[PDB]
C-alpha cells in the first residue's frame, strides 16, 4: 500500500546533481572511501552490528540496495527509483518495529534494483575476484512467482540450416535461461521444427517444470543440431496442437508459444487464423543471433497474437529478455485491481543473503499514477515490482515443539 501511494505522488526528474539521492549501496567496500560516489548519489556508510537472527552484519538504521553489475547505478530510471523508495525504507522500519522476528523484507523493483530492510553487505560479491555478482532480483523464484500467473509454455526452437554456428549456441543458451524462469506450478514442453516439427525430448506433452523435467529438457536442447529448411506452419501447428491437449495434467492458464528463430519471409497468417482466432494463446518471438535476415514476420506474429518481440544478438543479452516476457504476462494481473493482490508463498529455497532455508511471501506492486484522475495511462499496465518478506524454516520449526 505504501509503495503504491508513494509512487503515485512521484515527480519525474532528469537532474539529481542539485538534489542528491542518499542511499546505502550493498556492494560498497567497508573502506572509508570518499571517492566511491556517483555524480547523482551520495553513499551512506553504516555502522554494522552482529545479530544472532541473521548471522551477518546488520544495520537497522536504513535499508540497503542491490544494483546488478550489468545495470548502471546512476541512470535516470535507477535514480528515480532510489528517490521514491525512501518511504519503503520507513515502512520497513515500522514493520520490524511491530514484529521483531522479521527476516529480510524486500522490494524487488522492475528496474533491476532490490531494497531489503536490514542493511547488510552483499554476500561475497561486492568486490572480489572470481566472485562475480550475477544476482538479478527479477529472475528470483519469488519475483517470478509474484509477477504473473502460472504458465503453459511451449518453446518452439527453430533448428533449421540457417541457424548453424553462433545462432544455435545462443538459442540453446537462451532456452536454458528461459527454462530457468519456470516454477513448479508451470507446465512446459520444447518442440523443434525444420520442415517437420518434433519434440526435442522424450516428453510427448506439456510436463511440469520441476527440477528433473527441466534438466531433461535442458539436456535435449543442448543435444540439438541444426539442419534443413524452415516451415513456420508445421511448427506452429504442432505448438497449437500440444497446447490443445487436455488429457494431461496442466495449469489451465496463460497459454504461450516461445518462438526461437532468427528471421524469415514467412508470416503464416492462416495457421494463426485457424488455431488462434479468439487469441487465447500468446506468441513471443525471439530473433536470436547476429545476422541480416528479414525480421518483419517475426515482429508481426507478436502483434497479431498478443505477444512481444525480443532480440538476442549475443550472450549477455540473454538474461534480460526472459524477465521481459514475464513483464508482458502481468498486464491482465494489473487490470484486476485488488483481486490480484493476494499473498503467495514460494517453494522452500536457499536464501541469497545466506540464512538457510526460507520461504518468501510475495505481493505485487501496481503503478497507480493515473487513477480516478484518468490520464493517458501509458505504462500503467506494468507492475512496479514485487514485495517479499522471508520466513525462516527454522522459525516454522519452533512452532512445532
Amino acid at each position: 500500500l505504501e509503495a503504491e501511494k508513494v509512487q503515485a505522488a512521484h515527480q519525474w526528474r532528469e537532474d539529481f546533481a542539485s538534489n542528491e539521492v542518499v542511499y546505502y549501496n550493498a556492494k560498497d567496500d567497508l573502506d572509508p572511501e570518499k571517492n566511491d560516489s556517483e555524480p547523482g548519489s551520495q553513499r551512506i556508510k553504516p555502522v554494522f552490528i552482529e545479530d544472532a537472527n541473521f548471522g551477518r552484519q546488520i544495520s537497522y538504521q536504513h535499508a540497503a540496495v542491490h544494483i546488478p553489475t550489468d545495470i548502471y547505478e546512476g541512470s535516470t530510471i535507477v535514480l528515480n527509483e532510489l528517490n521514491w523508495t525512501s518511504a519503503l525504507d520507513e515502512v520497513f522500519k515500522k514493520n520490524r518495529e511491530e514484529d521483531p522476528s522479521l527476516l529480510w523484507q524486500v522490494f524487488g523493483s522492475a528496474t533491476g534494483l532490490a531494497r531489503y530492510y536490514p542493511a547488510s553487505p552483499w554476500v561475497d560479491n561486492s568486490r572480489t575476484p572470481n566472485k562475480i555478482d550475477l544476482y538479478d532480483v527479477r529472475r528470483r523464484p519469488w519475483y517470478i512467482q509474484g509477477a504473473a500467473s502460472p504458465k503453459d509454455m511451449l518453446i518452439l526452437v527453430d533448428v533449421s540450416g540457417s541457424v548453424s554456428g553462433l545462432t544455435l549456441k545462443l538459442i540453446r543458451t537462451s532456452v536454458s535461461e528461459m527454462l530457468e524462469t519456470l516454477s513448479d506450478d508451470d507446465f512446459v514442453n520444447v518442440a523443434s521444427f525444420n520442415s517437420n516439427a518434433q519434440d526435442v525430448s522424450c516428453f510427448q506433452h506439456l510436463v511440469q517444470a520441476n527440477v528433473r523435467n527441466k534438466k531433461v529438457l535442458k539436456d535435449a536442447v543442448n543435444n540439438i543440431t541444426a539442419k534443413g529448411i524452415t516451415d513456420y506452419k508445421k511448427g506452429f501447428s504442432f505448438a497449437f496442437e500440444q497446447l490443445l491437449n487436455y488429457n494431461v495434467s496442466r495449469a489451465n492458464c496463460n497459454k504461450i508459444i516461445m518462438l526461437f528463430t532468427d528471421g524469415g519471409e514467412e508470416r503464416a497468417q492462416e495457421i494463426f487464423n485457424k488455431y488462434n482466432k479468439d487469441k487465447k494463446v500468446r506468441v513471443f518471438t525471439f530473433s536470436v543471433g547476429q545476422h541480416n535476415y528479414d525480421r518483419g514476420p517475426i515482429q508481426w506474429m507478436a502483434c497479431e497474437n498478443k505477444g512481444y518481440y525480443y532480440e538476442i544478438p549475443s550472450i549477455g543479452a540473454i538474461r534480460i529478455n526472459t524477465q521481459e516476457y514475464l513483464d508482458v504476462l502481468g498486464r491482465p494481473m494489473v487490470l484486476a485491481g485488488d483481486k490480484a493482490k493476494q499473498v503467495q508463498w514460494t517453494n522452500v529455497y536457499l536464501d541469497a543473503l545466506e540464512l538457510g532455508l526460507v520461504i518468501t511471501g510475495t505481493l505485487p506492486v501496481f503503478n497507480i499514477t493515473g487513477q480516478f484522475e484518468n490520464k493517458t495511462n501509458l505504462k500503467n499496465q506494468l507492475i512496479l515490482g514485487v514485495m517479499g518478506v522471508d520466513v525462516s524454516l527454522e522459525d516454522i520449526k519452533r512452532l512445532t515443539p
Partner: peptide, 19 residues
C-alpha cells in the same frame, strides 16, 4: 492440485506494444 485463481486474457489490455 494447481493454483485456483489466475489472471489472463483481459479485454482492457492494450496490445499495441509489440516492442
Amino acid at each position: 492440485k494447481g493454483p485456483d485463481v489466475c489472471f489472463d486474457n483481459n479485454v482492457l489490455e492494450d496490445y499495441t506494444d509489440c516492442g
